[PDB]
Enzyme design. Structure first.
Site, short mmCIF file in Angstrom:
data_model
loop_
_atom_site.label_atom_id
_atom_site.label_comp_id
_atom_site.label_asym_id
_atom_site.label_seq_id
_atom_site.Cartn_x
_atom_site.Cartn_y
_atom_site.Cartn_z
N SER A 1 0.77 -1.21 0.00
CA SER A 1 0.00 0.00 0.00
C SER A 1 0.82 1.27 0.00
CB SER A 1 -1.01 0.01 1.12
OG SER A 1 -2.09 0.90 0.83
N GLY A 2 1.86 1.29 0.79
CA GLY A 2 2.63 2.55 0.84
C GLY A 2 3.90 2.59 0.03
N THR B 1 1.94 3.67 -8.05
CA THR B 1 1.23 4.57 -8.99
C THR B 1 2.18 5.56 -9.55
OG1 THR B 1 -0.47 4.69 -7.21
CG2 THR B 1 -1.06 5.57 -9.40
N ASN C 1 -0.57 5.65 2.61
CA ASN C 1 -0.36 6.60 1.57
C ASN C 1 -1.44 7.70 1.66
OD1 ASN C 1 0.62 7.94 -0.51
ND2 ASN C 1 0.53 6.27 -2.00
N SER D 1 -3.50 6.48 -2.12
CA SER D 1 -3.35 5.07 -2.39
C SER D 1 -4.24 4.57 -3.48
CB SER D 1 -3.56 4.26 -1.16
OG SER D 1 -2.79 3.05 -1.22
N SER D 2 -3.69 3.67 -4.29
CA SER D 2 -4.42 3.06 -5.40
C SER D 2 -5.38 2.01 -4.85
CB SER D 2 -3.44 2.40 -6.36
OG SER D 2 -3.65 2.91 -7.67
N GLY E 1 0.71 -6.59 -3.99
CA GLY E 1 1.45 -7.75 -3.72
C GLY E 1 0.95 -8.38 -2.50
N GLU F 1 0.11 -9.58 0.65
CA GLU F 1 0.08 -8.93 1.94
C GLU F 1 -0.56 -9.94 2.89
OE1 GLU F 1 -0.82 -4.55 1.01
OE2 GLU F 1 0.41 -4.44 2.90
#
Lengths: 372, 643, 372
Positions: free
Chosen positions: B79-80, B84, B138, B141-142, B364, B366
């Site tokens: 996530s972080g 992107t 983030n 975040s995407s 990915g 997680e």
């Protein structure tokens, strides 16, 4: 999608075939289960000589052909003529090529082991389908009503059945078959309507007695004081207009026809009737499962569509069952296609993929593989 | 761990680990994306220049024209990690180094709607308003995955693009954690830079009026909702959307807010739900091109079709609130999907295409103490992606030993993972059992569970019954993925997987005055034929049978596209949860490394002959050793040289 | 707390397991002592193939499994199936990991030395518990009633026992075992109730005869002029409503069932009965301890719960004992869990810590260590 779109569901009946794609809400194809063979040599204008006719072209042209029914009482009796109805279903009705579509088929309640192996032999060896599967009809009806334990009263064109199912396994020794259904029922109406002082003389008179049965017939609760009601002559009567003007009236007989399903004695049948049979199936099952079956009487089949069938059955078995019991007669609206819809659901399902019998299984295990 | 760390404390964010291109979040600004660099990395093998993303990105291009094969770039991280950012940055790269619309190049509304190179670009900022949000990790975040196909021409100049979206976080639309927030759009719109909008949508500027969107946070200091609103706005236009559509989008995005404001009450002496007012409904109704009443009915007295007819069913208060939420989400999603399509549509040119370069951005593997359905879907995606690599490497490796003449035999490295994959995707595997039970009108999560066991337990190795304690929250089943053991909780799955939607309402949508809304629903309206009666199979009419039925189909269409590709890998890393440049928590980076594939690439390397030098990377660094004879070798044949 | 919270108490029976944490007032887990093995291949919806079933899932699904009882008459007869019931107890019922909990177990009165060593071998070597301890059942029952000398009449599902205990040591040579208990007693009621003109036909009829026995059965004092009373037909009768309405009446048989415990002759048993056996145990003990045992007849076990059991026993042994003696029949209300509660007390106790057999003792002394 490969087969998400691609699974076919074919429900073979004594009167009608119901067919279509797993995924759809209702059958794409519904048509008579006949195979007509021309009594004389000749042609229709613009066509060639035809050796055979199937479905509606056999019905429409019945005057020059000898009509034959491949499925007697739910069981396939003629395999030459059945392969003909299947051929018609794939190639003309659904217009698909079968060799790239998985096919879910249905069979009847105590369908002989050898038949389930034979239609597998014909599906894989003469139609070359990728994979197939045979579901039992009552079992798809139940499942289409959400549940897994219940007892299905299934009634179509040539057979009636009671199939008690527990966590999916239909219970062989508790299943009852009553050979009186919608076909028998149209012919009895026929006589009580000619007996009302009428004549179904030409074939355009014959066929429509069946459309009278479907549209105007009723199953009255307290069929006793319904005859009594008939006599005081209320606005209970009902006139139907024939292919022409000839307005025929049907007041009373309207319900004397489905009272045949509770009283087989109306037709010289000595067998017990629908409600008693529901019950007897039930006192033939394990004791601990009888509260389940009683609260889950699922109805399916064209002949269980007569309005007020459920109320009569409701009261018919409450009054035979121990009062400590909960009775519950489920009769859904789409019930003339329950069987099919249960197959559509199941075969489009995410988890069913691992039960499809593939040509790999077959070419390696023989018809035995799918037979279970 | 230590190498990464050291070159980071020195401010080097790009270090390679085999084929990978590790990338660490700077957390500050760098002259790397520098317009000088872009050129520098232009026409250079990765041995002629230091570790950097443009290396990967250029080589792809090169390779693209050199080998006449299509390419791919797989960006992945938590996530972080900041993917992107990279993705975008890669994209610019392509656009720059091989554009030339000739006419579109002039400094006259350059990059505005009316050119792709721009459209291509402009794409992002729209999707981002709708599929991005402030995560606790983030700030942008995407919340979805993506795959772009940049279709290069014959010459080598840009020709087309292609987006595809995967797994959108539908839940944000209705929920939000305490330190997070929903999609930007909402906050963008209520920012007030375009006041008409506020009156047009019939809302206020205070988010606390829209429960759905202010459960968490409303404002983020690093974001200027006002600026974005335009960015967004302008992008739409460039993207070629019709004003009307551009109007639908907006109007539609507000309806959704309103829905969450829709309130109900118990009918007296009845357990039925009855509308608690026609204040909001009115707005939602109008905004969607609906009728207030018809709408509230359908909602309250859902008219179903069990058997061969249509049976009118009554709902509870709790049932409504939940159904509403289901549409809110449903609608948003679809829309989002549509936007993408529409984008794609503009991004469609007639010019010939010979090859493409796929840029894949997804999450990915997680691991959470709590792993639900969504986790499986993602993990599964990754475990596949991994095998995809392990193989490419096996293929690759084996060429060297063939080129050199070494005698090394070895089995595909992918194979190790096939076990796990089959268990998930194969016929009697998880998904199936999952998607079958979804056909049983009276199945339970519990039901499903048992079916899962009876069939896999004891018989399957990768299949295991959970370890309920540690940092985990409950028990159901663990799997043995390459990265490790994941403890999965099966609760809601059946539902989530069924995508239950009140069909009466959908009906209304289907006949809206707002074409767009009408459109979005079409595909539901066309499969109803197929699931006419109670029970059965939705697929008969083209309706989804599984929540998972597609995911798979899409994931296949993808992994297939990935194959006719020359895979290029990029692994994005996140230094410290605390957001500090030049720092790194150990175990945090360590984690990523395992789940990344980095540690597995090292393994496979070490089997054996650990360190493996790429030829140019070999020349440069060591020519100096027999300077005359090693330089000649390296120059004379990039490979033959090192020899 | 380390183990104050942490001690487990598992009482293994012929019919039921009682389990929970030392400290609690009653068992956290109570369930049948069965292990079901499926007679056919197949699955429940949503589950996988299961090799085995234990406790209530074995009872509920009994129609497709072969049920087996690991403990015959209080002694563990099948060790593969017992390790299965223990596994179920720790991991599913109490949901604890065993390797961090001390475990107090119980055994039967003259439990073979070799068994106490075998369950220790399985506790320490396959479950890896930190420490364990095996208490004798009558001994925990006594102790849970406060005292240390008394004689326990213990009666559950497969065995009855008399265990004379003196200052804590159960007296081997005076212990009596009578293999007729609550299981035998439900099957006898069954017949005197079908014999009343009834039918427990389905499995939902079978199971509830046991719930009739528990709710409505009595042990009358002067069982003689209770039959006589039955005949004059007082409002002694008692009707129970079945799973459904079917109101069954039980007047008399209500007490003919526990009169089986005093007269084994009702069931073709030639053995002596409960009260005589209490007594015989007692005239097999030392002379000087017989006043103690007589004033401390502690009752425990599910089958000693029949109301008026204590009054009948009171008068049964007064009239066999020398009149110089004080008789005293203690029957507490929680008696269906005496055994368990005695273990809960003991194992949560401040002084018991020094009798726990630890893995240190075991890895160093072999199973012999706990065997005593």
């Amino acid at each position: 999608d490969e087969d998400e779109t691609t699974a076919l569901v074919c429900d073979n009946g004594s009167g009608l075939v119901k067919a279509g794609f797993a995924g759809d809400d209702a059958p794409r194809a519904v048509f008579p289960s006949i195979v007509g063979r021309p009594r004389h040599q000749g042609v229709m204008v613009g066509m060639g000589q035809k050796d055979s006719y199937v479905g509606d072209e056999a019905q429409s042209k019945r005057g020059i052909l000898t009509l034959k029914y491949p499925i007697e009482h739910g069981i396939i009796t003629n395999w030459d003529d059945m392969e003909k109805i299947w051929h018609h279903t794939f190639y003309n009705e659904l217009r698909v090529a079968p060799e790239e579509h998985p096919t879910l088929l249905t069979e009847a309640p105590l369908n002989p082991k050898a038949n389930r192996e034979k239609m597998t032999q014909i599906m894989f060896e003469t139609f070359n389908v990728p994979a197939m599967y045979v579901a039992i009809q009552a079992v798809l009806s139940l499942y289409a009503s959400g549940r897994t334990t219940g007892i299905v009263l299934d009634s179509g064109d040539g057979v009636t059945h009671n199939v008690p199912i527990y966590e999916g396994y239909a219970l062989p020794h508790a299943i009852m078959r009553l050979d009186l259904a919608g076909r028998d029922l149209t012919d009895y109406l026929m006589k009580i309507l000619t007996e009302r002082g009428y004549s179904f003389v030409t074939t355009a008179e014959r066929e429509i007695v069946r459309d009278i049965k479907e549209k105007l017939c009723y199953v009255a609760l307290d069929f006793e004081n319904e005859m009594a009601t008939a006599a005081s002559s209320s606005s209970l009567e009902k006139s139907y207009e024939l292919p022409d003007g000839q307005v025929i009236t049907i007041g009373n007989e309207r319900f004397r026809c489905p009272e045949t399903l509770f009283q087989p004695s109306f037709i010289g049948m000595e067998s017990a009737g629908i409600h008693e049979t529901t019950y007897n199936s039930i006192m033939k099952c394990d004791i601990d499962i009888r509260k389940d079956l009683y609260a889950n009487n699922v109805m399916s089949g064209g002949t269980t569509m007569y309005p007020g069938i459920a109320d009569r059955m409701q009261k018919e078995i409450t009054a035979l069952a121990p009062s400590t019991m909960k009775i519950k007669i489920i009769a859904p609206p789409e019930r003339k296609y329950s069987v099919w819809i249960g197959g559509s659901i199941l075969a489009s399902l995410s988890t069913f993929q691992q039960m499809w019998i593939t040509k790999q299984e077959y070419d390696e295990a023989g018809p035995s593989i799918v037979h279970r | 761990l230590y190498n990464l760390k050291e070159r980071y404390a020195a401010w080097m964010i790009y270090t390679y680990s085999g084929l990978f291109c590790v990338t660490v979040n700077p957390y500050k600004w760098l002259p790397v994306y520098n317009p000088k660099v872009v050129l520098a990395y232009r026409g250079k093998k990765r041995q002629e220049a230091p570790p950097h993303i443009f290396s990967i990105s250029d080589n792809a291009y090169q390779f693209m024209l050199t080998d006449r094969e299509n390419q791919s770039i797989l960006i992945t991280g938590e996530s972080g990690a900041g993917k992107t950012v990279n993705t975008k940055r890669v994209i610019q790269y392509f656009a720059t180094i091989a554009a030339s619309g000739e006419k579109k190049k002039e400094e006259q509304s350059g990059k505005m709607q009316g050119t792709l190179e721009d459209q291509i670009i402009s794409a992002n900022p729209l999707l981002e308003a709708f599929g991005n949000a402030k995560t606790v990790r983030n700030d942008n975040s995407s919340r979805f995955g993506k795959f772009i196909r940049i279709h290069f021409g014959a010459t080598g100049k840009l020709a087309s693009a292609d987006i595809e979206t995967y797994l959108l976080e539908k839940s944000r639309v209705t929920f939000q954690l305490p330190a997070e927030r929903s999609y930007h759009i909402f906050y963008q719109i209520m920012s007030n830079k375009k006041p008409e909008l506020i009156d047009m949508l019939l809302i206020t500027t205070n988010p606390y009026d829209y429960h759905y969107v202010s459960e968490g946070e409303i404002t983020v200091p690093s974001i200027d909702d006002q600026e974005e609103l335009m960015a967004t706005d302008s992008a739409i236009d460039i993207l070629g959307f019709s004003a009307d559509e551009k109007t639908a989008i907006y109007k539609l995005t507000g309806a959704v807010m309103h829905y969450g404001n829709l309130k109900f009450k118990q009918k007296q002496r009845e357990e039925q739900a009855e509308p608690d007012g026609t204040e909001v409904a009115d707005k939602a109704a109008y905004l969607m091109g609906l009728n207030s009443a018809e709408l509230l009915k359908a909602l309250c007295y859902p008219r179903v079709g069990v058997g061969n007819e249509a049976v009118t069913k009554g709902e509870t208060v709790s049932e409504v609130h939940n159904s509403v939420g289901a549409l809110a989400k449903a609608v948003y999603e679809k829309m989002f999907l549509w936007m993408v399509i529409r984008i794609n549509q503009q991004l469609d040119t007639k010019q010939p295409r010979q090859y493409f370069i796929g840029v894949l951005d997804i999450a990915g593997f997680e691991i959470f103490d709590f792993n639900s359905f969504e986790q499986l879907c993602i993990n599964f995606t990754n475990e596949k992606l991994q095998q995809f690599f392990n193989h490419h490497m096996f293929v690759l490796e084996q060429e060297e030993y063939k080129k050199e003449g070494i005698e090394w035999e070895f089995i595909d490295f992918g194979m190790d993972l096939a076990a796990c994959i089959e268990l998930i995707e194969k016929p009697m595997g998880i998904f199936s059992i999952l998607e079958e039970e979804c056909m049983f009108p009276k199945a339970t999560d519990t039901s499903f569970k048992n079916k899962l066991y009876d069939e896999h337990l004891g018989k399957s190795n990768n299949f295991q019954k959970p370890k309920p304690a540690k940092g985990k929250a409950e028990a159901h089943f663990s799997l043995v993925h390459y990265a490790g053991t994941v403890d999965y909780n099966i609760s809601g799955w059946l539902e989530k997987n069924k995508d239950p939607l009140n069909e009466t309402v959908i009906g209304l949508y289907q006949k809206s005055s707002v074409k767009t809304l009408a459109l979005l629903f079409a595909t539901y309206g066309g499969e109803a034929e197929g699931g006419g009666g109670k029970k059965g199979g939705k697929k008969k009419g083209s309706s989804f049978q599984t929540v998972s039925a597609l995911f798979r189909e899409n994931l296949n269409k993808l992994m297939a596209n990935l194959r006719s590709t020359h895979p290029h890998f990029v692994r994005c890393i996140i230094p410290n949860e605390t957001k500090t440049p030049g720092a790194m928590e150990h175990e945090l980076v360590l984690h990523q490394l395992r789940c990344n594939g980095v540690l597995e690439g090292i393994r496979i390397c070490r089997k054996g002959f650990p360190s493996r030098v790429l030829y140019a990377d070999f020349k440069q660094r060591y020519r100096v050793l027999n300077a005359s004879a090693i330089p000649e070798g390296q120059f004379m044949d990039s490979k033959k040289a090192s020899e």
